[PDB]
Design a protein around this ligand. Structure first.
Ligand SMILES: C[As](C)(=O)[O-]
Lengths: 693, 6
C-alpha cells in the first residue's frame, strides 16, 4: 500500500461531537499531493488488476456480445423519421433521418467525429417541420453544453451558437421560428431563441433572483398553443405549473412574462399529458402517491376532477396521448410494466397488455401520431422496438426491430421474481437470474445490484456483461428493489429517505441474507455493486455487515455524508439525505456516513474471523456531479483503518480505486465503459475465487 | 442515450 499522509490536526465540532478529518487535503483535486495519491493508487490498482487473469477474457467476451447493430425508437416530424443507430461497437450512437421507416438512412450528426466520441448526444431536438436539428455539444470535460443548429436538408450549420446550457431541452414553436430553452447566466432562466439571431437577443420569459436554487423544465402543448413552464426545488417529485397562452400575444414572443400560475406551490407533481383548448389532462401525485390522471379547465382553475383514479396497488409511471383520442398508460405492477390503452375523453379502459419481466420505455409518439413505438429490454432480451398501429391494427404489438446477441442462447438461462422480508417485515421484490437447473447448494458466486433513493425505479434491463457473468462465471445475478425507490409510489420512496434511509440498507442486507438462506450463494461469495446513491448503498452495507460480502464495487459513491452538501450539486440531495448543518439530521447521517464508519470487524467479540470484502472504489477523475474526494477519502480511510495502521493486518482482501483518467460523470464511450466493466468483473472473479467456464 | 448495453 502506498504511503498516504494523515493531517492529524483537522477536527470539526458537530453539535458537541468531535469528528477528525485526516484526509481533508484530498478535497483539493489540483494539489500535487492529491495528484500523487491518484498516481499511487492507480499504480496499486494496476498491480492488483494484473493479478486478475480473467480481465482479458471478460473484456473480449463483452466486446463480442455487444457487437450487434442497434436501431433506437424512431420518432416523427412532418414526413421524416429520426432515430439513433450504432453498428455495434461505435463509441457513441449516430443520429439518423429517413423519409421512410424502412428506407435508406442519412446521417444527420455523428458524435464519434468529435473528441473520438468521448460523449454522445444528450440534447437532440428536431423542429416541427423537420427542417432543423438543435443539439448540445460538450466543449471539454465540464457539464456545460453549447447548442448548435443544423439544417436537415444539407447538414449545414446555422451561425447561431447558444452557450451556458446544461440539461435544457430545446422546445420548438409550431411556427418553426425558434425554441424555448433554459440557460444559466454568464439562477436558471427560461428564454426564447429566434433562429438567425445572436443569443444576446433571446427573449427572457422567467427568472427568480429571490429563489436562485429553483430549477426549470418546459414543454409546449401538441396543438402549439401553450407554453408550459415547470418550476422545481431540489430533487423532490413536485413542481409548479405556469401556463402561457401563445395565441393571445399581440405580437408573438416579440411582444416581450404573464404566466397563468395554475400551480404555485411545491406540494405535488404535475405533468401535462393533453389538452383540448383550455381543458387540460395532467398526471399528478396530489393525494395520490401511486399517481393518477386529473382534468382541469384553465378558465376555471380551482376545480380539478379525476379522470383515471389512483390504483390501490400500481404506480402510474407515465401517460401518453396518441392517435388523436387515446391514452397509453404505463403502469408499474410489482416492478413489471403493464400497458393500457384508454379513451382520452372518458378515461375508459379499452385494452390491457401485461409485459414480461423487463422494461418498456421510450414512448415518444405524439397525439397526432397513429403508430406508437417503444423499446422493450430484459435481462435475457437485448432490445426490441415494438410498433402498435392504433389506426389499422390496435390490438397487436408487432416487432419493428430486434437486437440479436451473437452466440447467446437465452434458453439456457432463467429469470424469476421473488419477495423477501426485510427486518421490519416489509416485502422486498428481487429479480434473480441464473443458468437453468442449478443446484441451490450454496456454491455459486452472486452479484447483487441496487440503488434505493430519489424515487428511481430499478428495472431488469439488458446487460451484455451480466450474461458473461452468468455464462462464463456460473454466476447468480440479483437486482433488489429496495425502499427509497419509486416502485410502489411515493410511500416507498419516503420509507427509504431522511431519518429512514437506514431502511434501504436493511432491505439490501435482507436480500443478501435470503440469497444465502435459499442456497444460491454463501456469505463471502456475494458481490455487491452500485453507483452514486447506489455507491453509498454499497459502502454503508459493507461497513455494517462486512461478514456477508466477498466483493464490493462502489461507483462514484457519496461517501462523506457530513460534507457532501458543500460540493457542486450536492446541495440538491438534502431532500433525500438531510444535512449535517442541522443537528437532528446530523444524528441520522453520522450513523451511516461511510468514511465515518470504517471499523475493524475482527475487533468485535465473536467476529474475529471477519474482514472487509475485496473492495474496488470506482470514479472518473473529473466527476462534477459526485466529486471524487468522496471516493478518495473513503479509500484512504479504509486503507488506514484496515491495513497500514497495523503491522500485519488480518485484512488480506485488497482495497483499491479504479480511477478513470480524463473522464466526466457523463460520457461512457463504448470501449471506455467496456474496459471499466471488464476490470470490475475480473476483480470480482478473483475476489470470489471463481473459475472461468 | 447510452452507446451500448454494457
Ligand atoms: C446523482 As445521485 C447522489 O442522486 O444518485
Amino acid at each position: 500500500y502506498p504511503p498516504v499522509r494523515r493531517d492529524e490536526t483537522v477536527v470539526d465540532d458537530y453539535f458537541g461531537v468531535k469528528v477528525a478529518d485526516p484526509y481533508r487535503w484530498l478535497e483539493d483535486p489540483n494539489s500535487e499531493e492529491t495528484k500523487e495519491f491518484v498516481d499511487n493508487q492507480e499504480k496499486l490498482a494496476n498491480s492488483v488488476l494484473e493479478e486478475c487473469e480473467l480481465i482479458d477474457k471478460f473484456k473480449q467476451k463483452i466486446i463480442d456480445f455487444v457487437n450487434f447493430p442497434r436501431c433506437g425508437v424512431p420518432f416523427r416530424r412532418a414526413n421524416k423519421y429520426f432515430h439513433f443507430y450504432n453498428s455495434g461497437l461505435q463509441a457513441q450512437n449516430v443520429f439518423q433521418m429517413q423519409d421512410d421507416l424502412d428506407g435508406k438512412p442519412e446521417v444527420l450528426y455523428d458524435p464519434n467525429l468529435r473528441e473520438g466520441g468521448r460523449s454522445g448526444l444528450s440534447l437532440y431536438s428536431v423542429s416541427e417541420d423537420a427542417k432543423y436539428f438543435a443539439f448540445g455539444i460538450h466543449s471539454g470535460l465540464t457539464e456545460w453544453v453549447t447548442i448548435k443548429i443544423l439544417k436537415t436538408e444539407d447538414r449545414s450549420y446555422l451561425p447561431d451558437t447558444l452557450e451556458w446550457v446544461k440539461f435544457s431541452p430545446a422546445i420548438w414553436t409550431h411556427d418553426n421560428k425558434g425554441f424555448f430553452y433554459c440557460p444559466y447566466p454568464p439562477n436558471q432562466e427560461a428564454r426564447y431563441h429566434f433562429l438567425g439571431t445572436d443569443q444576446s437577443e433571446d427573449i427572457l420569459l422567467w427568472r427568480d433572483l429571490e429563489n436562485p436554487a429553483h430549477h426549470l423544465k418546459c414543454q409546449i402543448t401538441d396543438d402549439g398553443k401553450y407554453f408550459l413552464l415547470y418550476i422545481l426545488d431540489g430533487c423532490d417529485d413536485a413542481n409548479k405549473v405556469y401556463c402561457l397562452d401563445l395565441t393571445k400575444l399581440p405580437n408573438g414572443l416579440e411582444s416581450f412574462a404573464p404566466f397563468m400560475k395554475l400551480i404555485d406551490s411545491f406540494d405535488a407533481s404535475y405533468t401535462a399529458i393533453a389538452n383540448d383548448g383550455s381543458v387540460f389532462t395532467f398526471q399528478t401525485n396530489k393525494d395520490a402517491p401511486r399517481k393518477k390522471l386529473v382534468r382541469v379547465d384553465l378558465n376555471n382553475p380551482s376545480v380539478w376532477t379525476d379522470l383515471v383514479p389512483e390504483s390501490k396497488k400500481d404506480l402510474l409511471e407515465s401517460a401518453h396521448a396518441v392517435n388523436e383520442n387515446q391514452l397509453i398508460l404505463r403502469y408499474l405492477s410489482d416492478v413489471k410494466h403493464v400497458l393500457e390503452i384508454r379513451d382520452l375523453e372518458s378515461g375508459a379502459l379499452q385494452h390491457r397488455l401485461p409485459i414480461d419481466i423487463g422494461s418498456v420505455d421510450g414512448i415518444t409518439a405524439r397525439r397526432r401520431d397513429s403508430v406508437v413505438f417503444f423499446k422493450f429490454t430484459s435481462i435475457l432480451t437485448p432490445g426490441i422496438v415494438y410498433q402498435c398501429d392504433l389506426k389499422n391494427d390496435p390490438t397487436q404489438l408487432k416487432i419493428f426491430r430486434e437486437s440479436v446477441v451473437p452466440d447467446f442462447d437465452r434458453s439456457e438461462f432463467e429469470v424469476k421474481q421473488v419477495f423477501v422480508p426485510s427486518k421490519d417485515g416489509t416485502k422486498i421484490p428481487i429479480f434473480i437470474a441464473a443458468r437453468k437447473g442449478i443446484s441451490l447448494d450454496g456454491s455459486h458466486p452472486c452479484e447483487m445490484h441496487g440503488y434505493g433513493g430519489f424515487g428511481i425505479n430499478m428495472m431488469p434491463t439488458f446487460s451484455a456483461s451480466r450474461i458473461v457473468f452468468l455464462k462464463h462465471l456460473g454466476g447468480v445475478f440479483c437486482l433488489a428493489n429496495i425502499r427509497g425507490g419509486g416502485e410502489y409510489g411515493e410511500e416507498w420512496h419516503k420509507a427509504g429517505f431522511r431519518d429512514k434511509k437506514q431502511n434501504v440498507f436493511d432491505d439490501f442486507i435482507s436480500a443478501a441474507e435470503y440469497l444465502i438462506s435459499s442456497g444460491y450463494t454463501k456469505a463471502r461469495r456475494v458481490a455487491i455493486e452500485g453507483g452514486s446513491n447506489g455507491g453509498l448503498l454499497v459502502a454503508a452495507c459493507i461497513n455494517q455487515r462486512p461478514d456477508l460480502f466477498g466483493c464490493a464495487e462502489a461507483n462514484c459513491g457519496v461517501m462523506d455524508m457530513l460534507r457532501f452538501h458543500k460540493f457542486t450539486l450536492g446541495y440538491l440531495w438534502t431532500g433525500d439525505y438531510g444535512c449535517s448543518d442541522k443537528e437532528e439530521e446530523f444524528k441520522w447521517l453520522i450513523k451511516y456516513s461511510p468514511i465515518h464508519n470504517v471499523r475493524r470487524p475482527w475487533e468485535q467479540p465473536g467476529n474475529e474471523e471477519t474482514q472487509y470484502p475485496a473492495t474496488m472504489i470506482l470514479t472518473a477523475d473529473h466527476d462534477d456531479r459526485v466529486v471524487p474526494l468522496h471516493s478518495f477519502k473513503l479509500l484512504a480511510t479504509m486503507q488506514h483503518v484496515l491495513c497500514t495502521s497495523l503491522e500485519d493486518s488480518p485484512q488480506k482482501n485488497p482495497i483499491i480505486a479504479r480511477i478513470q483518467r480524463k473522464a466526466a460523470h457523463y460520457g461512457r464511450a463504448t470501449m471506455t465503459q467496456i474496459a471499466e466493466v471488464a476490470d470490475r468483473y475480473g476483480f470480482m472473479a478473483k475476489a470470489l475465487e471463481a473459475p472461468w467456464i | 442515450n447510452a452507446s451500448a448495453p454494457v
